[PDB]
Design an enzyme around this catalytic site. Sequence first.
Site, PDB file in Angstrom:
ATOM      1  N   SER A  76       0.793  -1.227   0.000  1.00  0.00           N
ATOM      2  CA  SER A  76       0.000   0.000   0.000  1.00  0.00           C
ATOM      3  C   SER A  76       0.826   1.279   0.000  1.00  0.00           C
ATOM      4  O   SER A  76       0.240   2.352  -0.221  1.00  0.00           O
ATOM      5  CB  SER A  76      -0.994   0.056   1.173  1.00  0.00           C
ATOM      6  OG  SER A  76      -1.978  -0.974   1.110  1.00  0.00           O
ATOM      7  N   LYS A 132       0.462   3.480  -3.079  1.00  0.00           N
ATOM      8  CA  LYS A 132      -0.683   4.373  -3.278  1.00  0.00           C
ATOM      9  C   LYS A 132      -0.280   5.839  -3.414  1.00  0.00           C
ATOM     10  O   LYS A 132      -0.983   6.603  -4.097  1.00  0.00           O
ATOM     11  CB  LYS A 132      -1.699   4.232  -2.145  1.00  0.00           C
ATOM     12  CG  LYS A 132      -2.601   2.999  -2.280  1.00  0.00           C
ATOM     13  CD  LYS A 132      -3.470   2.822  -1.071  1.00  0.00           C
ATOM     14  CE  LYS A 132      -4.395   1.634  -1.270  1.00  0.00           C
ATOM     15  NZ  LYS A 132      -3.652   0.351  -1.129  1.00  0.00           N
ATOM     16  N   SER A 139      -6.242   2.721   3.302  1.00  0.00           N
ATOM     17  CA  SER A 139      -5.510   1.859   2.364  1.00  0.00           C
ATOM     18  C   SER A 139      -6.466   0.976   1.558  1.00  0.00           C
ATOM     19  O   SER A 139      -6.249  -0.226   1.397  1.00  0.00           O
ATOM     20  CB  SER A 139      -4.466   0.993   3.091  1.00  0.00           C
ATOM     21  OG  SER A 139      -3.867   1.664   4.189  1.00  0.00           O
ATOM     22  N   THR A 187       1.108   3.472   5.662  1.00  0.00           N
ATOM     23  CA  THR A 187       1.406   2.116   6.100  1.00  0.00           C
ATOM     24  C   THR A 187       1.299   1.143   4.933  1.00  0.00           C
ATOM     25  O   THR A 187       0.645   1.416   3.924  1.00  0.00           O
ATOM     26  CB  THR A 187       0.477   1.680   7.239  1.00  0.00           C
ATOM     27  OG1 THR A 187      -0.862   1.525   6.751  1.00  0.00           O
ATOM     28  CG2 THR A 187       0.510   2.659   8.412  1.00  0.00           C
ATOM     29  N   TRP A 222       1.264  -3.386   4.195  1.00  0.00           N
ATOM     30  CA  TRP A 222       1.258  -4.750   4.721  1.00  0.00           C
ATOM     31  C   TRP A 222       0.964  -5.683   3.552  1.00  0.00           C
ATOM     32  O   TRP A 222      -0.187  -5.792   3.124  1.00  0.00           O
ATOM     33  CB  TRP A 222       0.235  -4.930   5.827  1.00  0.00           C
ATOM     34  CG  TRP A 222       0.423  -6.215   6.587  1.00  0.00           C
ATOM     35  CD1 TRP A 222       1.079  -7.345   6.156  1.00  0.00           C
ATOM     36  CD2 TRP A 222      -0.085  -6.523   7.888  1.00  0.00           C
ATOM     37  NE1 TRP A 222       1.030  -8.317   7.122  1.00  0.00           N
ATOM     38  CE2 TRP A 222       0.319  -7.841   8.194  1.00  0.00           C
ATOM     39  CE3 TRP A 222      -0.829  -5.807   8.831  1.00  0.00           C
ATOM     40  CZ2 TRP A 222      -0.006  -8.458   9.399  1.00  0.00           C
ATOM     41  CZ3 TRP A 222      -1.144  -6.423  10.032  1.00  0.00           C
ATOM     42  CH2 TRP A 222      -0.734  -7.735  10.302  1.00  0.00           C
ATOM     43  N   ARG A 267       3.516  -1.510  13.892  1.00  0.00           N
ATOM     44  CA  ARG A 267       4.373  -0.663  13.069  1.00  0.00           C
ATOM     45  C   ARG A 267       4.488   0.735  13.657  1.00  0.00           C
ATOM     46  O   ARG A 267       5.593   1.286  13.745  1.00  0.00           O
ATOM     47  CB  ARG A 267       3.835  -0.595  11.638  1.00  0.00           C
ATOM     48  CG  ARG A 267       3.963  -1.901  10.868  1.00  0.00           C
ATOM     49  CD  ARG A 267       2.968  -2.016   9.716  1.00  0.00           C
ATOM     50  NE  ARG A 267       1.613  -1.590  10.050  1.00  0.00           N
ATOM     51  CZ  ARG A 267       0.627  -1.489   9.166  1.00  0.00           C
ATOM     52  NH1 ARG A 267       0.821  -1.762   7.884  1.00  0.00           N
ATOM     53  NH2 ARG A 267      -0.583  -1.102   9.576  1.00  0.00           N
TER      54      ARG A 267
HETATM   55  C1  LIG Z   1      -3.799  -3.022   0.874  1.00  0.00           C
HETATM   56  O1  LIG Z   1      -3.019  -3.289  -0.296  1.00  0.00           O
HETATM   57  C2  LIG Z   1      -2.903  -3.136   2.099  1.00  0.00           C
HETATM   58  C3  LIG Z   1      -1.780  -2.118   1.957  1.00  0.00           C
HETATM   59  O2  LIG Z   1      -0.521  -2.795   1.965  1.00  0.00           O
HETATM   60  C4  LIG Z   1      -3.720  -2.902   3.364  1.00  0.00           C
HETATM   61  C5  LIG Z   1      -3.812  -4.144   4.262  1.00  0.00           C
HETATM   62  C6  LIG Z   1      -3.306  -3.720   5.638  1.00  0.00           C
HETATM   63  S1  LIG Z   1      -4.641  -3.473   6.768  1.00  0.00           S
HETATM   64  C7  LIG Z   1      -5.543  -2.002   6.365  1.00  0.00           C
HETATM   65  C8  LIG Z   1      -6.974  -2.343   6.022  1.00  0.00           C
HETATM   66  N1  LIG Z   1      -7.728  -1.110   6.313  1.00  0.00           N
HETATM   67  C9  LIG Z   1      -7.067  -0.422   7.445  1.00  0.00           C
HETATM   68  C10 LIG Z   1      -7.857  -0.720   8.691  1.00  0.00           C
HETATM   69  O3  LIG Z   1      -7.288  -1.110   9.704  1.00  0.00           O
HETATM   70  N2  LIG Z   1      -9.185  -0.543   8.611  1.00  0.00           N
HETATM   71  C11 LIG Z   1     -10.126  -1.633   8.848  1.00  0.00           C
HETATM   72  C12 LIG Z   1      -9.788   0.742   8.268  1.00  0.00           C
HETATM   73  C13 LIG Z   1      -5.673  -1.028   7.538  1.00  0.00           C
HETATM   74  C14 LIG Z   1      -2.710  -2.385   5.350  1.00  0.00           C
HETATM   75  C15 LIG Z   1      -1.981  -1.555   6.301  1.00  0.00           C
HETATM   76  O4  LIG Z   1      -2.631  -0.958   7.191  1.00  0.00           O
HETATM   77  O5  LIG Z   1      -0.734  -1.447   6.194  1.00  0.00           O
HETATM   78  N3  LIG Z   1      -2.920  -1.994   4.178  1.00  0.00           N
END
Ligand SMILES: *[C@H](O)[C@H](CO)[C@H]1C[C@H](S[C@H]2CN[C@@H](C(=O)N(C)C)C2)C(C(=O)O)=N1
Length: 239
Positions: free
Chosen positions: A45, A48, A92, A183, A185, A225
Amino acid sequence: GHNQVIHQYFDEKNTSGVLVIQTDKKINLYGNALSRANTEYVPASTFKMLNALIGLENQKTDINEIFKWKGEKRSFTAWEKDMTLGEAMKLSAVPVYQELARRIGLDLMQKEVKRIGFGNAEIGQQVDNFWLVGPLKVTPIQEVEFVSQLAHTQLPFSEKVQANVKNMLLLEESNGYKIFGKTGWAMDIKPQVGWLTGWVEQPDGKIVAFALNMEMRSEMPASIRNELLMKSLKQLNII
Ligand SMILES: *[C@H](O)[C@H](CO)[C@H]1C[C@H](S[C@H]2CN[C@@H](C(=O)N(C)C)C2)C(C(=O)O)=N1
């Protein structure tokens, strides 16, 4: 300033990681796996930031456009809503950014990624997932130079577009300090890689860029993180 204390932070979270700090083109490494700083990982992510820059610069979208959720199940219930590009950044929300990437298209995205020189600058054939499972890869040193350039408005995009994207990345605003960051992941690759790339805007206006990169595992909380990064910046007295 030590360098041993931050090592004990990563030793104890039972992870393998590096924290790259960049002040005024001076790069320092911290953590407990320093050789991570110069090896390539998928950006997940964190890409982005570049995806938005390319999309806005090329007028495939704007900061007011509302991206319509069309009803398909998504990985998090927080993603199942209409949102702007900046809301999708804050959550993200990869489906929104995959739609943008399809608008840009393969030619424009490869031409831009190669013109910017991001990581290995290779996107392969699928325009909407090259940043999650390859072939695009980037070292954490390259990530801290990319985000440093963004903070200083030095990337090869128009200044209004860079400013627009910077305003989507404000994470924290306490004590005259501002932390911006994205962030990441990658959960669908082994080992999993976690990112936290951004910069500190100190009350005097100084900029300190950072790129935290660590190996990940499904059981840890997302905030691990931020916990590693925050107490590392307090130890180096960047906050
Ligand atoms: C999407 O490609 C990816 C980026 O590397 C997402 C997965 C994780 S978790 C992400 C999901 N939405 C955020 C959250 O906690 N909510 C439910 C709003 C966090 C991620 C990340 O946070 O690094 N990015």
